[PDB]
Amino acid sequence: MGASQESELDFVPRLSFLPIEWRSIGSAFGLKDKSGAAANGRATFTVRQGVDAAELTSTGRVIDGQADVGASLKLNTLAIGVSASNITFHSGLDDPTAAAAQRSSLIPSLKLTAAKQFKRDNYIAVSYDLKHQKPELSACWTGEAGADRATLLVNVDPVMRSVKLAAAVRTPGPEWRKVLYNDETDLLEYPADDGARHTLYVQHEVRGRDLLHATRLGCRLDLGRLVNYVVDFVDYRIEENIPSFVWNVPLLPQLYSLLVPADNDEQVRHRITGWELDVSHDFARSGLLPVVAISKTSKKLLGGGTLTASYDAAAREAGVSLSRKGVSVGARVARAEGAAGGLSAGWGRPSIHVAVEPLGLLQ
Amino acid sequence: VLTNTQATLLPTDLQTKRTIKPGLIYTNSALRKFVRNVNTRLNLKLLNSKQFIYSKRWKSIFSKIQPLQNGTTRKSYQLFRNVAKQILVTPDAKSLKLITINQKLSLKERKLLELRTQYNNNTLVRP
Amino acid sequence: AVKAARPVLVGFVLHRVLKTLDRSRQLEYRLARMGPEEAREAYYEAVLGKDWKQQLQADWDKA
Numbered sequence: 001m002g003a004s005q006e007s008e009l010d011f012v013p014r015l016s017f018l019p020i021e022w023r024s025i026g027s028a029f030g031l032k033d034k035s036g037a038a039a040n041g042r043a044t045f046t047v048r049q050g051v052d053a054a055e056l057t058s059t060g061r062v063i064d065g066q067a068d069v070g071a072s073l074k075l076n077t078l079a080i081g082v083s084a085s086n087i088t089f090h091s092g093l094d095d096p097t098a099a100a101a102q103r104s105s106l107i108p109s110l111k112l113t114a115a116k117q118f119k120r121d122n123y124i125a126v127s128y129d130l131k132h133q134k135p136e137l138s139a140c141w142t143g144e145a146g147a148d149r150a151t152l153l154v155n156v157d158p159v160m161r162s163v164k165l166a167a168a169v170r171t172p173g174p175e176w177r178k179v180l181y182n183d184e185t186d187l188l189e190y191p192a193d194d195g196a197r198h199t200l201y202v203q204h205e206v207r208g209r210d211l212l213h214a215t216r217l218g219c220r221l222d223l224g225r226l227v228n229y230v231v232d233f234v235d236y237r238i239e240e241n242i243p244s245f246v247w248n249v250p251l252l253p254q255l256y257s258l259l260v261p262a263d264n265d266e267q268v269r270h271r272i273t274g275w276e277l278d279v280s281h282d283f284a285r286s287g288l289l290p291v292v293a294i295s296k297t298s299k300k301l302l303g304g305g306t307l308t309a310s311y312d313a314a315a316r317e318a319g320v321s322l323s324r325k326g327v328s329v330g331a332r333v334a335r336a337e338g339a340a341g342g343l344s345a346g347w348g349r350p351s352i353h354v355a356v357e358p359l360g361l362l363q
Numbered sequence: 364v365l366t367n368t369q370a371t372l373l374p375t376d377l378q379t380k381r382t383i384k385p386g387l388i389y390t391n392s393a394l395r396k397f398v399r400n401v402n403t404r405l406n407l408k409l410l411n412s413k414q415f416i417y418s419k420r421w422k423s424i425f426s427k428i429q430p431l432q433n434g435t436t437r438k439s440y441q442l443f444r445n446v447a448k449q450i451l452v453t454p455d456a457k458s459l460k461l462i463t464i465n466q467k468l469s470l471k472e473r474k475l476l477e478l479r480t481q482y483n484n485n486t487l488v489r490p
Numbered sequence: 491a492v493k494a495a496r497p498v499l500v501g502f503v504l505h506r507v508l509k510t511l512d513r514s515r516q517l518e519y520r521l522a523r524m525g526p527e528e529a530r531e532a533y534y535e536a537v538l539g540k541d542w543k544q545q546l547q548a549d550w551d552k553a
């Protein structure tokens with residue numbers, strides 16, 4: 001119950017990896033009615049205490065606000081859409097980092113897009129940005145096959161010769177439950193569904209003659225399914241192969257009883273739910289260092305609130321985030337580069353960011 | 364002449380362009396030949412185009428009993444496991460614990476059992 | 491092991507996307523997503539051709 005009208009192209013809660021115009025097209029074709037107009041938005045706010053890049057002294061506070069706005073309307077089958085993306089609002093004084101981010105930001109742009117639903121859940125679009133006046137073509141194919149669901153998105157621009165692909169699969173993944181046979185009623189018994197799933201996504205961007213210019217990949221795993229699968233494999237294929245003398249050391253069979261318990265009727269050994277693990281990594285960024293987050297989607301805390309603890313090794317940053325329905329209060333802390341030799345790598349710079357969708361605030 | 368119970372079994376709007384001799388044997392022969400012809404056409408068209416069941420009771424029984432809580436049942440399990448791995452387990456089977464709870468069903472029997480489960484849960488000339 | 495395991499993972503995700511997307515558009519899920527009567531014609535459109543009424547009439551006349 002409580003199924004919201006989410007984007008049919010977006011998969012991941014609390015994470016966005018699509019262009020805003022395609023999210024507006026997917027939200028416009030997600031209407032229950034056969035005609036109507038839709039609107040969508042994103043915003044993010046960064047607050048911190050400003051640290052100067054030269055003398056490492058605190059100068060003030062830097063607040064930045066970035067915005068994405070999309071609007072579309074739908075005819076009998078087509079959609080027309082106008083979007084305003086990547087508008088940056090900057091507050092702060094005497095900061096070279098703010099100016100360097102302003103030079104290297106996503107530019108505030110306005111876009112027209114004329115989208116045709118050429119097949120059911122198969123869409124094609126031609127968009128054309130107005131401020132930079134550049135045209136590009138795009139295609140999207142989404143599909144549902146019982147348990148799993150896939151989405152592929154292609155964006156081709158002949159001006160910069162940029163080819164972008166996005167791809168995602170939500171699938172239950174590996175299964176450990178058995179199809180039982182009832183000896184009394186002469187019928188099979190299939191395992192019931194859980195609703196939890198593993199998400200795999202890839203982004204692949206080519207800019208110019210660099211045929212592998214950028215590639216990012218991400219994997220999101222339910223922890224309970226993985227732990228129960230591992231415990232089932234150990235109990236059914238490994239336990240009979242352990243040599244006998246292993247059990248004669250003290251406390252080891254009891255420890256194996258705590259870690260691997262007995263099997264039951266619903267065929268789960270450990271009742272773990274709501275915990276989830278995110279591993280995301282990009283290849284164009286140097287060093288090949290992962291971004292690892294653990295998340296709890298607790299129902300009792302503010303109505304399905306997600307508490308997230310994250311680490312990135314490239315920026316040496318840790319994060320504590322509270323999220324609910326597109327609202328995200330994330331306090332991240334940065335381990336600075338320590339002094340030249342001996343016990344000087346401490347934690348400074350708390351920074352609070354707020355992500356919001358104001359049209360998702362009405363739910 | 365064919366009865367009402369037969370008339371709702373075959374797909375409708377079939378026209379009969381010929382007079383058949385009266386009697387039940389001729390009607391049943393014509394329907395039987397019709398079923399044969401439709402199945403032949405379906406299989407020709409299909410050829411011109413381009414799962415381990417386990418037992419609930421035995422799994423519950425073998426999960427209910429525990430070895431390893433003391434050395435006595437552990438040693439009984441070790442002795443049985445040695446002899447059973449020597450003579451009872453066939454090479455294509457992957458585990459002794461897996462085949463002691465496997466319901467050893469043939470391919471056609473498990474296909475028919477899937478079909479009957481699908482019937483109890485919820486073509487052309489099958490009825 | 492970067493140059494060996496990187497395109498393996500990339501091609502694994504892309505192949506899983508392609509073989510989920512292709513496996514979501516065949517007979518049974520489409521027939522699951524329509525109502526029963528038009529399912530009864532669409533079954534015949536798949537397994538018997540376009541003019542399935544004429545083919546059943548030829549089988550009946552041969553009988």
